[PDB]
Design a binder for these strands. Structure first.
Ligand SMILES: [Mg+2]
Ligand SMILES: [Mg+2]
Ligand SMILES: [Mg+2]
Ligand SMILES: [Mg+2]
Ligand SMILES: [Mg+2]
Ligand SMILES: [Mg+2]
Ligand SMILES: [Mg+2]
Ligand SMILES: [Mg+2]
Ligand SMILES: [Mg+2]
Ligand SMILES: [Mg+2]
Ligand SMILES: [Mg+2]
Ligand SMILES: [Mg+2]
Ligand SMILES: [Mg+2]
Ligand SMILES: [Zn+2]
Lengths: 98, 24, 64, 206, 60, 84
RNA sequence: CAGGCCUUGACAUGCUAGGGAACCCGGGUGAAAGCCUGGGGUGCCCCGCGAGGGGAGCCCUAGCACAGGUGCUGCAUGGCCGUCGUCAGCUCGUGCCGUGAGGUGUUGGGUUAAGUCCCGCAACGAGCGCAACCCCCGCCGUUAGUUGCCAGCGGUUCGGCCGGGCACUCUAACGGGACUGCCCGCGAAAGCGGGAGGAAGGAGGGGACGACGUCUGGUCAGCAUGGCCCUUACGGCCUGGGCGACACACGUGCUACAAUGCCCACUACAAAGCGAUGCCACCCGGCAACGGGGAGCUAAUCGCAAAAAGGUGGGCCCAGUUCGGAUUGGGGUCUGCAACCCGACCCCAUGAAGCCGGAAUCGCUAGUAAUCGCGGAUCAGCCAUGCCGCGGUGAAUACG
């Protein structure tokens, strides 16, 4: 009954990762609770375009943090064996907690 | 109105709470 | 009904009703549509653009 | 005063970042400073080699760092002793225990960052700006490319009235958000002041 | 930015109310962003280079 | 309608410095920079000199002005009108 | 700005040297900085019986290379930006015309939001720009279900609470969908008008994106950089004052002059955000700000939150008023070393001008204006009515 929470700036980097974590544990154990999206928190940065004056320049920036769930219930050694061994994504930070 | 700090709206405006605008 | 204001909800409810009506009897469209009830009003709150005060409301200038 | 950075303009599309690492709302302003500190050295103790891009990945006290260069030999070192000096002198900036790499630039004539450097280089010596530009535009065009463009600013030729020399060939569609145009800028300290040098290289499209 | 004024780096201020910020990069102070440690100018520059991971151009 | 709470602040520069004067007599003038100090009974009778940010001014502290922060009797601006 | 104070200097690299050099804790003076002083206190590699001799890190002083300067020049500059203007343009190659500067192409006729496209033509093409490629919103499908839900059944302390279910809403990733494709008419063509189907129709709505150039445009106080200038001071520390001064003038705004309103009560609909010494449920104390305690959340599963306008009821009765809150007196909370100069908030008292504004002048063509509330960055706190952004209710008018 392990709940995995994957997050990342790139949505495909997660879609990629998360997909693996599923296909993997989709054998050694349960078929997982399916990867779930979860709302995305978004950072905004509104910075005056040029230095000095021109208060009306602006330009908009944003740092979008995506999330996922997966959620694997019924861990069976190998279920955890397909995990700790195979890893890849760089822009993906994982959180496994049952 | 929004100007009066000792009324419902006065508070809401100044975004405060008090006798005139209780935190429920 | 969830989201927005009751005036907006009234309209959505009006769509849902117009829609279900069609499942009950598809032949309703031919007469329910000439009124456009089956159209999804796409009018929406415009983004607040920088520089201006409200998407459009433009700050005013004195003796330009 | 106009024109968006051609790179920043297409990060979502045809153009990856130069630092790709997961979340971090309490350390972002630390890994970043680090990524910076890093590039600091690399864009110094690695100039003469064609430093054309310093990528960086991470994963819990583990930095990747992939220095792309036109002359890796200069990076590696005799038999391979300098790349060893870097790594060490490098982990002196940050513990972390960070890797390193040296992928080469297959043809620096199609590397905007480099082309900028070449032109800025000659200028620093004392070559004919207009020439330098025409030639570079050529080379870049000469070695493939679907378009190229170079822009030197400053006091061209030590002149007192700052100007701006042009030069471009083929297509350089800055608006078409998908063209895939490599951008590069190069400074140019001079006996009489700075000169900016911009290079645009158009490669394929889709 | 006076080199001298970047004394702020002195985590040794008589009282914490005197401790301010300053840009990590340009050494500014007028409008630095906590999440980055960079000023509004430095942030746009780095942002554009793609050196700010995950950061991008907001459109909507 | 001033405020402080619980601790009516006083810079012990002159505080410990004023109570020592009481133990004996009254020292003519006592230059201070603790413009931020709250006046207290003890200070009464004394003569603390406060800084404008330019000069030190003689301020005979009375029992009816206790509580008022020091300075506050040492104006900063020099304004005599725009008239002409 | 005034005063106190330091000088190789708060920060980089390096040399000569009287000479102790690592380090650690106090005292004196002072506003602080600084200055004077007592004093636990040197291992290190190396020669040596040892007195002692010498080097390395560190370390103070003298002297040197030198630091440092938001000190001047945006008419020496890079970089970034503003601007015409998102306007429909600006050019090139070869050819052709002209003695030549140059011209043609890019003009002409139709058309478009557009140098958009069509037709024509000594021009044939090309590039920058227009459009398209990207993002958000409208409809639908697949994938995913701790959001959702008696849609469907059972239990209910009747709160979707519980079992349970992925249907719906939603969440987020991919994908379909519109192309003047289809019918009618005009047309040489592009295209124009009208009609059908469709959530959507002729660029469906909003963004990002800004041509060659223009202005001796803006910024050397973001940064960078040529030159000039100061180097016991045009550098550095500190304490305090000033940037908050006022007889006045202007710009941008806030609140309002009221009954389509003000007020008190009860009651209902939102989105986008934010949260570690952080948001703070709930309880208690206090009129209150807030305080004491204290659960939950690292945050679709907890919190900020109350949305306000609206709805139902009740009061006021046209008054400078139960309109409007300036100003001042008093008491107090919180932040912070500290709120006199110079914070915000609470409560009592006070309760100003103001009755819709002269000449003149501004914004906006629809989910716009108008009106209402909500969030965020910076940030201890805050002078935010500023700014960036979110959703609610939702017009008038355009002959020309
Ligand atoms: Mg009132
Ligand atoms: Mg609105
Ligand atoms: Mg501060
Ligand atoms: Mg200029
Ligand atoms: Mg300039
Ligand atoms: Mg000027
Ligand atoms: Mg002629
Ligand atoms: Mg001829
Ligand atoms: Mg065209
Ligand atoms: Mg375009
Ligand atoms: Mg000028
Ligand atoms: Mg000011
Ligand atoms: Mg318009
Ligand atoms: Zn900066």
């Amino acid at each position: 009954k392990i709940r995995i929470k994957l997050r990342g700036f790139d949505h495909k980097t997660l879609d990629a990762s998360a997909q693996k974590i599923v296909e993997a544990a989709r054998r050694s154990g349960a078929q997982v609770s399916g990867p779930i999206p979860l709302p995305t928190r978004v950072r905004r940065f509104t910075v005056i375009r040029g230095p000095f004056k021109h208060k009306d320049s602006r330009e908009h920036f944003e740092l979008r943090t995506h999330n996922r769930l997966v959620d694997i219930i019924n861990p069976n050694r190998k279920t955890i064996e397909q995990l700790m061994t195979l890893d890849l994504p760089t822009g993906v930070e994982i959180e496994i907690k049952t | 109105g929004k100007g009066d700090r000792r009324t419902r709206r006065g508070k809401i405006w100044r975004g405060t709470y008090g006798k005139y605008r209780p935190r429920k | 009904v969830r989201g927005g204001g009751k005036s907006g909800q009234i309209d959505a409810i009006k769509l849902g009703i117009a829609r279900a009506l069609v499942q009950y009897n598809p032949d309703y469209r031919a007469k329910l549509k000439p009124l456009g009830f089956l159209t999804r009003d796409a009018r929406v709150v415009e983004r607040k653009k920088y520089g201006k005060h409200k998407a459009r409301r433009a700050p005013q200038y004195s003796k330009r | 005063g106009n024109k968006i950075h051609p790179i920043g303009f297409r990060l979502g599309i045809t153009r990856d970042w130069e630092s790709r690492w997961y979340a971090g709302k309490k350390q972002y302003r630390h890994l970043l400073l680090e990524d910076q500190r890093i590039r600091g050295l690399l864009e110094k103790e690695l100039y003469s080699a064609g430093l054309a891009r310093v990528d960086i990945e991470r994963a819990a006290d583990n930095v990747a760092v992939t220095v792309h260069v036109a002359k890796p030999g200069v990076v590696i070192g005799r038999g391979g002793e300098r790349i060893r000096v870097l790594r060490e002198e490098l982990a002196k900036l940050t513990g972390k225990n960070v890797a390193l790499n040296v992928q080469e630039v297959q043809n620096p004539n199609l590397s905007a960052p480099l082309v900028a450097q070449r032109v800025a280089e000659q200028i620093e010596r004392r070559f004919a700006v207009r020439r330098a530009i025409k030639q570079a535009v050529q080379r870049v065009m000469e070695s493939g490319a679907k378009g190229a463009k170079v822009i030197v600013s400053g006091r061209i030729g030590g002149a007192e009235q700052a100007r701006t020399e042009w030069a471009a060939q083929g297509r350089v569609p800055l608006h078409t958000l998908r063209a895939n145009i490599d951008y590069g800028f190069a400074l140019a300290r001079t006996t009489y002041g700075v000169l900016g040098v911009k290079a645009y290289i158009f490669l394929g499209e889709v | 930015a006076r080199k001298a004024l970047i004394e702020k780096a002195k985590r040794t201020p008589k009282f914490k109310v005197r401790a301010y910020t300053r840009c990590v990069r340009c050494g500014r102070a007028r409008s630095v962003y906590r999440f980055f440690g960079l000023c509004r100018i430095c942030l746009r520059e780095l942002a554009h280079k793609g050196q700010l991971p995950g950061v991008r151009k907001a459109s909507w | 309608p001033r405020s402080l709470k619980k601790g009516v602040f006083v810079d012990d520069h002159l505080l410990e410095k004023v109570l020592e004067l009481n133990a004996k007599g009254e020292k003519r003038l006592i230059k201070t920079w603790s413009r931020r100090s709250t006046i207290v009974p003890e200070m009464v009778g004394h003569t603390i000199a406060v800084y404008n940010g330019k000069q030190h001014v003689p301020v005979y502290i009375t029992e009816n002005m206790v509580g008022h922060k020091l300075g506050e009797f040492a104006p900063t601006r020099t304004y005599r009108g725009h008239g002409k």
